[PDB]
Protein backbone atom coordinates (compact mmCIF):
# COMPACT_ATOMS: atom_id res chain seq x y z
CA UNK A 1 0.00 0.00 0.00
CA UNK A 2 1.08 3.63 -0.51
CA UNK A 3 -1.21 6.04 1.33
CA UNK A 4 -2.13 5.11 4.89
CA UNK A 5 -1.72 5.93 8.58
CA UNK A 6 1.89 7.16 8.21
CA UNK A 7 1.16 9.33 5.15
CA UNK A 8 1.93 8.86 1.46
CA UNK A 9 4.83 8.87 -0.99
CA UNK A 10 3.50 11.02 -3.86
Amino acid at each position, epitope marked *: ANG*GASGQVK
Partner: antibody
Framework: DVKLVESGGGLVKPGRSLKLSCAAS????????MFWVRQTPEQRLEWVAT????????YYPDSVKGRFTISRDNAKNNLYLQMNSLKSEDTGMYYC????????????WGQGTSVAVSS | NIVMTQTPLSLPVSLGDQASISCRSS???????????LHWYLQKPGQSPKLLIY???NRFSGVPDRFSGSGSGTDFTLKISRVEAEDLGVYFC????????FGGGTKLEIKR
Protein backbone atom coordinates in the same frame (compact mmCIF):
# COMPACT_ATOMS: atom_id res chain seq x y z
CA ASP B 1 7.36 29.63 4.87
CA VAL B 2 5.23 26.76 6.22
CA LYS B 3 3.17 27.60 9.30
CA LEU B 4 0.63 25.60 11.36
CA VAL B 5 -1.35 27.12 14.25
CA GLU B 6 -3.39 24.92 16.60
CA SER B 7 -6.15 26.33 18.79
CA GLY B 8 -9.21 25.27 20.78
CA GLY B 9 -7.69 23.39 23.71
CA GLY B 10 -9.26 23.75 27.14
CA LEU B 11 -10.58 21.93 30.16
CA VAL B 12 -13.37 19.41 29.65
CA LYS B 13 -15.09 17.05 32.09
CA PRO B 14 -14.60 13.30 31.55
CA GLY B 15 -17.02 11.94 28.91
CA ARG B 16 -17.23 15.37 27.32
CA SER B 17 -16.03 16.62 23.94
CA LEU B 18 -14.11 19.46 22.30
CA LYS B 19 -12.99 20.46 18.80
CA LEU B 20 -9.43 21.45 17.95
CA SER B 21 -8.47 23.42 14.82
CA CYS B 22 -5.16 23.83 13.02
CA ALA B 23 -4.68 26.70 10.56
CA ALA B 24 -2.19 26.02 7.78
CA SER B 25 -0.46 28.62 5.61
CA UNK B 26 2.52 28.87 3.25
CA UNK B 27 1.94 25.66 1.26
CA UNK B 28 -0.74 24.02 -0.88
CA UNK B 29 -2.68 22.48 2.01
CA UNK B 30 -4.79 20.20 -0.19
CA UNK B 31 -1.75 18.29 -1.48
CA UNK B 32 -0.60 16.98 1.92
CA UNK B 33 -1.64 14.26 4.34
CA MET B 34 -1.93 15.79 7.82
CA PHE B 35 -1.61 14.44 11.37
CA TRP B 36 -2.54 15.15 14.97
CA VAL B 37 0.14 14.14 17.49
CA ARG B 38 -0.12 14.67 21.26
CA GLN B 39 2.43 14.89 24.06
CA THR B 40 1.44 13.83 27.59
CA PRO B 41 2.39 15.59 30.84
CA GLU B 42 5.25 13.08 31.23
CA GLN B 43 6.38 14.23 27.74
CA ARG B 44 5.78 11.11 25.60
CA LEU B 45 4.67 11.72 22.01
CA GLU B 46 1.71 9.72 20.68
CA TRP B 47 0.27 9.83 17.16
CA VAL B 48 -3.53 10.32 17.38
CA ALA B 49 -4.82 10.82 13.83
CA THR B 50 -4.07 10.86 10.12
CA UNK B 51 -6.05 12.23 7.22
CA UNK B 52 -5.34 11.90 3.51
CA UNK B 53 -4.76 15.03 1.38
CA UNK B 54 -8.25 14.97 -0.13
CA UNK B 55 -9.94 14.01 3.16
CA UNK B 56 -11.49 10.65 2.17
CA UNK B 57 -9.14 8.43 4.25
CA UNK B 58 -8.70 8.66 8.03
CA TYR B 59 -6.51 6.59 10.40
CA TYR B 60 -6.38 6.31 14.20
CA PRO B 61 -4.61 4.18 16.82
CA ASP B 62 -6.73 1.91 19.05
CA SER B 63 -6.52 4.34 21.97
CA VAL B 64 -8.68 6.88 20.09
CA LYS B 65 -10.60 4.92 17.45
CA GLY B 66 -14.34 5.64 17.61
CA ARG B 67 -14.00 8.74 19.84
CA PHE B 68 -11.83 11.06 17.73
CA THR B 69 -12.61 12.29 14.23
CA ILE B 70 -9.98 14.07 12.14
CA SER B 71 -11.37 16.26 9.33
CA ARG B 72 -10.23 19.07 7.06
CA ASP B 73 -11.46 21.99 5.04
CA ASN B 74 -9.24 22.35 1.97
CA ALA B 75 -10.87 25.65 0.91
CA LYS B 76 -10.13 27.31 4.27
CA ASN B 77 -6.74 25.61 4.88
CA ASN B 78 -7.96 24.19 8.18
CA LEU B 79 -7.33 20.84 9.78
CA TYR B 80 -9.67 19.69 12.59
CA LEU B 81 -9.94 17.21 15.41
CA GLN B 82 -13.26 16.46 17.08
CA MET B 83 -12.66 14.61 20.38
CA ASN B 84 -15.64 12.79 21.96
CA SER B 85 -15.95 10.76 25.21
CA LEU B 86 -12.80 12.37 26.61
CA LYS B 87 -10.82 10.51 29.30
CA SER B 88 -8.19 11.77 31.77
CA GLU B 89 -5.52 9.98 29.66
CA ASP B 90 -6.33 12.32 26.75
CA THR B 91 -4.87 15.22 28.84
CA GLY B 92 -1.91 16.60 26.84
CA MET B 93 -0.53 19.08 24.31
CA TYR B 94 -2.04 18.55 20.84
CA TYR B 95 0.00 19.31 17.76
CA CYS B 96 -0.93 19.20 14.11
CA UNK B 97 1.84 18.14 11.73
CA UNK B 98 2.37 17.76 8.01
CA UNK B 99 3.29 14.76 5.89
CA UNK B 100 6.03 15.56 3.35
CA UNK B 101 5.38 14.54 -0.24
CA UNK B 102 8.28 12.18 -0.95
CA UNK B 103 8.63 10.13 2.24
CA UNK B 104 6.36 9.06 5.14
CA UNK B 105 7.22 11.51 7.94
CA UNK B 106 6.28 14.71 9.79
CA UNK B 107 8.20 17.79 8.54
CA UNK B 108 6.45 20.79 10.10
CA TRP B 109 4.61 20.94 13.42
CA GLY B 110 2.57 23.76 15.04
CA GLN B 111 3.14 25.35 18.46
CA GLY B 112 0.33 23.27 19.99
CA THR B 113 -2.89 23.57 22.01
CA SER B 114 -3.33 22.09 25.49
CA VAL B 115 -6.21 19.84 26.49
CA ALA B 116 -6.99 18.82 30.08
CA VAL B 117 -9.75 16.36 31.02
CA SER B 118 -10.74 16.40 34.70
CA SER B 119 -13.83 16.37 36.91
CA ASN C 1 3.15 -1.27 17.85
CA ILE C 2 6.70 -0.74 16.72
CA VAL C 3 8.46 0.21 19.93
CA MET C 4 11.16 2.86 19.73
CA THR C 5 13.73 2.97 22.56
CA GLN C 6 16.31 5.69 23.16
CA THR C 7 19.80 5.37 24.66
CA PRO C 8 20.88 7.09 26.62
CA LEU C 9 18.09 8.68 28.64
CA SER C 10 20.22 11.75 29.17
CA LEU C 11 23.53 12.77 27.60
CA PRO C 12 25.42 15.56 29.34
CA VAL C 13 27.98 17.34 27.15
CA SER C 14 30.40 20.25 27.23
CA LEU C 15 30.28 22.84 24.44
CA GLY C 16 32.50 21.60 21.61
CA ASP C 17 32.09 17.94 22.44
CA GLN C 18 31.04 15.18 20.05
CA ALA C 19 27.55 13.74 20.79
CA SER C 20 25.99 10.40 19.95
CA ILE C 21 22.44 9.16 20.59
CA SER C 22 21.02 5.77 19.68
CA CYS C 23 17.54 4.63 18.70
CA ARG C 24 16.47 0.99 18.57
CA SER C 25 13.24 -0.20 16.90
CA SER C 26 11.47 -3.44 17.88
CA UNK C 27 11.27 -4.60 14.24
CA UNK C 28 12.97 -3.67 10.94
CA UNK C 29 12.25 -0.16 9.67
CA UNK C 30 12.81 -1.10 6.05
CA UNK C 31 9.54 -0.45 4.14
CA UNK C 32 8.26 -2.77 1.39
CA UNK C 33 9.48 -0.12 -1.09
CA UNK C 34 13.05 -0.49 0.27
CA UNK C 35 13.30 2.81 2.14
CA UNK C 36 13.76 3.21 5.88
CA UNK C 37 11.48 5.85 7.39
CA LEU C 38 13.45 6.63 10.53
CA HIS C 39 13.59 10.29 11.63
CA TRP C 40 15.11 12.52 14.30
CA TYR C 41 13.57 15.65 15.87
CA LEU C 42 14.76 18.23 18.40
CA GLN C 43 12.36 19.82 20.88
CA LYS C 44 13.27 22.86 23.03
CA PRO C 45 11.21 23.80 26.12
CA GLY C 46 7.89 25.45 25.23
CA GLN C 47 8.37 24.62 21.52
CA SER C 48 7.21 21.74 19.33
CA PRO C 49 9.52 19.12 17.84
CA LYS C 50 11.43 20.29 14.74
CA LEU C 51 12.70 17.89 12.05
CA LEU C 52 16.47 17.42 11.95
CA ILE C 53 17.27 14.24 10.04
CA TYR C 54 14.82 12.36 7.83
CA UNK C 55 14.98 8.86 6.36
CA UNK C 56 18.02 7.88 8.43
CA UNK C 57 20.64 10.36 7.18
CA ASN C 58 19.02 13.17 5.21
CA ARG C 59 19.48 16.62 6.74
CA PHE C 60 16.20 18.62 6.74
CA SER C 61 16.17 22.16 5.33
CA GLY C 62 18.23 24.58 7.44
CA VAL C 63 19.89 21.93 9.66
CA PRO C 64 23.63 22.50 10.03
CA ASP C 65 26.04 19.84 8.74
CA ARG C 66 27.20 19.30 12.35
CA PHE C 67 24.20 16.91 12.55
CA SER C 68 24.41 13.50 10.90
CA GLY C 69 22.42 10.27 11.02
CA SER C 70 23.03 6.63 10.19
CA GLY C 71 22.17 3.10 11.26
CA SER C 72 20.31 0.23 9.63
CA GLY C 73 17.49 -2.28 10.16
CA THR C 74 16.60 -1.56 13.78
CA ASP C 75 19.64 0.32 15.21
CA PHE C 76 20.23 4.01 14.47
CA THR C 77 22.26 6.92 15.82
CA LEU C 78 22.25 10.68 15.57
CA LYS C 79 25.61 12.38 15.82
CA ILE C 80 26.56 15.97 16.60
CA SER C 81 30.16 16.63 15.44
CA ARG C 82 30.46 19.62 17.76
CA VAL C 83 27.81 20.65 20.30
CA GLU C 84 26.59 24.22 20.59
CA ALA C 85 24.21 25.70 23.18
CA GLU C 86 21.38 25.90 20.63
CA ASP C 87 21.56 22.09 20.21
CA LEU C 88 20.42 21.53 23.80
CA GLY C 89 16.97 20.07 24.34
CA VAL C 90 15.39 16.66 23.85
CA TYR C 91 16.04 14.60 20.75
CA PHE C 92 13.37 12.19 19.64
CA CYS C 93 13.56 9.44 16.99
CA UNK C 94 10.35 8.26 15.30
CA UNK C 95 9.44 5.71 12.63
CA UNK C 96 6.93 6.17 9.80
CA UNK C 97 7.39 2.76 8.15
CA UNK C 98 4.33 1.49 10.08
CA UNK C 99 1.76 3.70 11.90
CA UNK C 100 3.83 6.42 13.52
CA UNK C 101 5.52 5.83 16.83
CA PHE C 102 8.13 7.77 18.78
CA GLY C 103 11.06 7.08 21.06
CA GLY C 104 10.91 8.43 24.64
CA GLY C 105 13.56 11.09 24.02
CA THR C 106 17.20 11.74 24.88
CA LYS C 107 17.86 15.02 26.70
CA LEU C 108 21.11 16.67 25.57
CA GLU C 109 22.28 18.84 28.48
CA ILE C 110 25.17 20.97 29.68
CA LYS C 111 27.76 19.07 31.69
CA ARG C 112 28.60 20.31 35.17
Amino acid sequence: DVKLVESGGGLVKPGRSLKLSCAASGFTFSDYYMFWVRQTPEQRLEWVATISDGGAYTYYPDSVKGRFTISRDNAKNNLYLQMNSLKSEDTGMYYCARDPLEYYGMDYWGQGTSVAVSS
Amino acid sequence: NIVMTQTPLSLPVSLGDQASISCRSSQSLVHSNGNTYLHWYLQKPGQSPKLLIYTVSNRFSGVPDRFSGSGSGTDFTLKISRVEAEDLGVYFCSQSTHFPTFGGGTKLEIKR
